[PDB]
Amino acid sequence: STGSATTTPIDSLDDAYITPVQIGTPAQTLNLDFDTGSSDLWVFSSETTASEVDGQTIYTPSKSTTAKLLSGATWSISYGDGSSSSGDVYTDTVSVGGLTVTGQAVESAKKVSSSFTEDSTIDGLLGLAFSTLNTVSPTQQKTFFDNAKASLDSPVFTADLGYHAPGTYNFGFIDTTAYTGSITYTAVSTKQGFWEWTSTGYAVGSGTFKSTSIDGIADTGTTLLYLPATVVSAYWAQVSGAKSSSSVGGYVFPCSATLPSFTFGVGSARIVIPGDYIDFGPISTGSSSCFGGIQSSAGIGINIFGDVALKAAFVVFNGATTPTLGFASK
Ligand SMILES: NCc1ccc(C(F)(F)F)cc1
Numbered sequence: 001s002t003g004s005a006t007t008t009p010i011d012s013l014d015d016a017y018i019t020p021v022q023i024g025t026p027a028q029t030l031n032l033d034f035d036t037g038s039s040d041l042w043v044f045s046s047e048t049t050a051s052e053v054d055g056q057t058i059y060t061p062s063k064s065t066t067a068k069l070l071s072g073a074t075w076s077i078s079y080g081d082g083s084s085s086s087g088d089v090y091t092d093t094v095s096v097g098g099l100t101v102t103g104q105a106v107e108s109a110k111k112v113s114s115s116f117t118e119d120s121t122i123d124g125l126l127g128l129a130f131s132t133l134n135t136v137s138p139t140q141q142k143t144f145f146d147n148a149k150a151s152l153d154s155p156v157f158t159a160d161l162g163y164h165a166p167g168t169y170n171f172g173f174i175d176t177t178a179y180t181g182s183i184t185y186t187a188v189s190t191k192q193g194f195w196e197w198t199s200t201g202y203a204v205g206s207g208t209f210k211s212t213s214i215d216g217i218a219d220t221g222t223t224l225l226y227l228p229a230t231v232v233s234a235y236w237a238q239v240s241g242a243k244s245s246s247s248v249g250g251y252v253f254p255c256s257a258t259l260p261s262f263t264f265g266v267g268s269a270r271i272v273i274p275g276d277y278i279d280f281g282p283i284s285t286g287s288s289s290c291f292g293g294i295q296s297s298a299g300i301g302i303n304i305f306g307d308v309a310l311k312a313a314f315v316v317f318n319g320a321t322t323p324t325l326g327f328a329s330k
Pocket residue numbers: 016033035037038079080081083115116119122221222
């Protein structure tokens with residue numbers, strides 16, 4: 001079997017992407033943030049503290065004839081940006097783009113942090129990292145991908161994120177019309193539960209490519225590109241007037257500047273991020289200082305190839321017994 005679903009940026013900056021997901025019987029459609037950096041499927045629900053809900057579509061388990069309460073199970077997650085949520089757990093039928101899994105753990109939020117409340121366009125997250133990171137206690141639960149794997153034509157999913165435009169998540173097949181040239185595959189380490197891989201280096205603009213190993217994760221749930229301080233300094237040094245601002249919390253640049261492209265290595269292949277992708281617009285309404293899409297990972301502790309990088313490529317998440325990541329230009 002296969003599935004295919006359109007994913008859409010939530011705003012004009014591509015801060016995040018939402019994908020419609022059908023939950024329950026009859027279907028309740030929620031728009032979820034597909035996150036290859038976490039492993040919980042959680043949703044706003046009828047159980048969420050009413051004051052913490054501000055426009056989200058809620059899942060109502062009592063209206064689903066296939067919903068079952070998972071007795072005594074709870075969940076609690078904290079994300080790298082300080083966001084968090086927690087609640088209880090149902091199992092229910094979940095379908096993405098025609099691909100249906102029965103008995104999927106659907107984590108119902110009782111409490112959400114304010115950053116989720118204020119994001120009225122995101123109804124929940126669908127985690128696509130490895131199941132070892134799932135937070136359900138006392139019995140850990142499997143991701144949607146893990147539950148679907150045996151039914152898929154091929155144990156893969158692909159991310160084709162658009163720049164200021166819709167894109168596609170496909171499950172179970174590789175659309176050979178969606179990319180150019182060939183797919184370069186690279187090894188994945190699952191030791192921390194992430195889609196973790198090693199980039200072979202980088203270049204700024206038309207500068208010389210620097211061969212150097214950058215260990216990082218492929219994370220559709222993170223907006224920006226977080227790289228070592230040395231690399232980020234080399235990039236922003238080429239932007240007249242750019243500087244690191246403590247009050248803003250990262251590199252900012254004069255909005256009138258043209259940004260250079262950023263190249264990262266996948267084995268011997270090169271993926272080029274156009275400079276326009278790195279512009280995240282004015283830091284506040286009306287400001288002539290703009291926020292940069294490449295930032296230092298020094299405070300984060302891990303390098304993150306977020307949407308800025310992934311949307312420049314066609315990305316294959318190969319969940320074979322030895323997992324790999326594939327990148328192609330598009
Ligand atoms: N990386 C997971 C994640 C995704 C979205 C959000 C936000 F922005 F919706 F709060 C927080 C954390």
